[PDB]
Paper text:
Acetylcholinesterase (AChE, EC 3.1.1.7) terminates cholinergic neurotransmission by rapidly catalyzing hydrolysis of the neurotransmitter, acetylcholine, at neuronal and neuromuscular synapses. The target sites of three of them, raised against the Electrophorus electricus AChE (EeAChE) subunit and named Elec403, Elec408 and Elec410, were identified using complementary binding, inhibition and mutagenesis approaches. Inhibition of the residual activity of the Elec403 complex by the positively charged organophosphate inhibitor, echothiophate, and the transition state analog, TMTFA, occurs at lower rates than inhibition of the unbound enzyme, while for the Elec410 complex only inhibition by TMTFA is reduced, and for the Elec408 complex both inhibition rates are unaltered. In conclusion, comparative analysis of a crystal structure of Fab408, which inhibits EeAChE by binding to the BDR, and of models of its Fab403 and Fab410 congeners, which inhibit EeAChE by binding the PAS, points to distinctive surface topographies and anisotropic repartitions of charges of their combining sites, consistent with their respective target sites at the EeAChE surface and the distinctive residual activities of their EeAChE complexes.
This electronegative patch confers on the Fab408 molecule a clear anisotropic distribution of surface charges with a moderate dipole moment of 484 Debyes and a vector oriented toward the H-chain N-terminus, opposite to the CDRs. At the center of the Fab408 combining site, the interface between the VH and VL domains forms a small pocket of 10-12 Å diameter lined by side chains from the protruding CDR-H2 and CDR-H3 and the shorter CDR-L3.
Numbering used by the authors:
A (entry chain H): 1 to 141, 144 to 224
B (entry chain L): 1 to 213
């Protein structure tokens, strides 16, 4: 029931600013503190600061005092965080997180509900759409066959991949993207019974929201 | 800033095992401590607060203990859904800080990789590029090393590798390795080899194709 819907992924230039949103549902929004946490690519967690949605009152981690500003909109049950003068250090996933009610005498300051997360990328690298390449065998008739898609030369993350519009999900391995020279490569493999391919259609579907692109690639033999 | 040091960095145990993760603090934090779980690709969830209080809805196989500068999270009868990173956090004096995390994996029986290799697509060759891809799927343990050989000579430049996280059904790992060349250098050669070392084979695992043969 309690949910914290955050805003979408961001690509920002190494001088600019960004404002992240956190929409609350299933509880009295102004009744509980709201916190913000950074998660570096190295998967370390850093507490940025806390805001009271009720009184506007605020406490910062001094390391973020120059970087972060926390704001509120009570009418829409939404908390905000702006990050100023961004550098590579600021590329991270940012979470909003609910703590205890404002009426607690108890000394328990835990984060009991975490937001959906907002991935922030800061770089001067250009948004580039993916090339999608089919991976098919040249062996004819194993009882299982492995097919794949190679998604190359795109920026920024994320790309998402499905097989047969998500209806083919068992035996799929979609691999983490690897950055080289400001462009990503990702691959995905799918293993199917050899009785079903090539007699039946297998297609990888690739989405790259940043560049407004969706690609379908049917895997054909040879 | 209170330093929070977790150990071990990585833990591997069988389904049904009891496991303990430790969090050591730079100050007596008087049990003002929380534990969180975070599964791959997901937001963290609260497990334990005040060092020993189980958060509601959390499975009872989880427990916390500690005092002074040493705190522990314990999982009785480890389950495959417990594969995740675990973090401790203090709330004693500002600023609140977190440990570096502990990653838990399920220990299972050794599993040999299923290896598939793919020449460049005709589509890519039209761009003047050529990627050869090797999949090494559903193996255990995670430790693997991949080398590329072209006409028998090891090639290191232009190789990109990535690993999946542990599979929630079968507890294996998979790996992908892509060697990218130019269409021109790709066409100067015949034999393309993906070669792996893994504990399930005494000798190197060799997967090749001949361009073309």
């Amino acid at each position: 029931e309690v949910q914290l819907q955050q805003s979408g992924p961001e690509l920002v230039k190494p001088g600019a600013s960004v404002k992240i949103s956190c929409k609350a549902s299933g509880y009295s929004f102004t009744g509980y503190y709201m916190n913000w946490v950074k998660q570096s690519p190295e998967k370390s967690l850093e507490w940025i600061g806390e805001m009271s949605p009720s009184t506007g009152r605020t406490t910062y981690n001094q390391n973020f005092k120059a970087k972060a500003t926390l704001t509120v909109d009570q009418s829409s049950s939404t908390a905000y965080m702006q990050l100023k003068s961004l550098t590579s250090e600021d590329s991270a996933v940012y979470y909003c997180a609910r703590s205890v009610p404002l009426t607690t005498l108890i000394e328990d300051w835990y984060f009991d509900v975490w937001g959906t997360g907002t991935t922030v990328t800061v770089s001067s690298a250009k948004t580039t759409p993916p090339s999608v390449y089919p991976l098919a065998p040249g062996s004819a008739a194993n009882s299982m066959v492995t097919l794949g898609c190679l998604v190359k030369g795109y920026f920024p993350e994320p790309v998402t991949v499905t097989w047969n519009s998500g209806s083919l999900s068992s035996g799929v391995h979609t691999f983490p993207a690897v950055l080289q020279s400001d462009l990503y490569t990702l691959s995905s493999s799918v293993t199917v019974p050899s009785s079903t391919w090539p007699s039946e259609t297998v297609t990888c579907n690739v989405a790259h929201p940043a560049s407004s692109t969706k690609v379908d690639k049917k895997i054909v033999p040879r | 800033d209170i330093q929070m040091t977790q150990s071990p960095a990585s833990l591997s145990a069988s389904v049904g095992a009891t496991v303990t993760i430790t969090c050591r603090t730079s100050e007596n934090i008087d049990s003002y401590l929380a534990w969180y779980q975070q599964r791959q690709g997901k937001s963290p969830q609260l497990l334990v607060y005040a060092a020993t209080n189980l958060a509601d809805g959390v499975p009872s196989r989880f427990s916390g203990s500690g005092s002074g500068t040493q705190y522990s999270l314990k999982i009785n009868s480890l389950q495959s859904e417990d594969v995740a990173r675990y973090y401790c956090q203090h709330y004693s004096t500002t600023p609140w800080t977190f440990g570096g995390g502990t990653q838990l994996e399920i220990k299972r029986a050794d599993a040999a990789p299923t290896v598939s290799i793919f020449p460049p697509s005709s589509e890519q060759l039209t761009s003047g590029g050529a990627s050869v891809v090797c999949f090494l799927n559903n193996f255990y343990p995670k430790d693997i090393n991949v080398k590329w050989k072209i006409d028998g000579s090891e090639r290191q430049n232009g190789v990109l590798n990535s690993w999946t996280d542990q599979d929630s059904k079968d507890s294996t790992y998979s790996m992908s390795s892509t060697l990218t060349l130019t269409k021109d250098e790709y066409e100067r050669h015949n034999s393309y080899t993906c070669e792996a070392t893994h504990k399930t084979s005494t000798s190197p695992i060799v997967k090749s194709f001949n361009r073309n043969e």
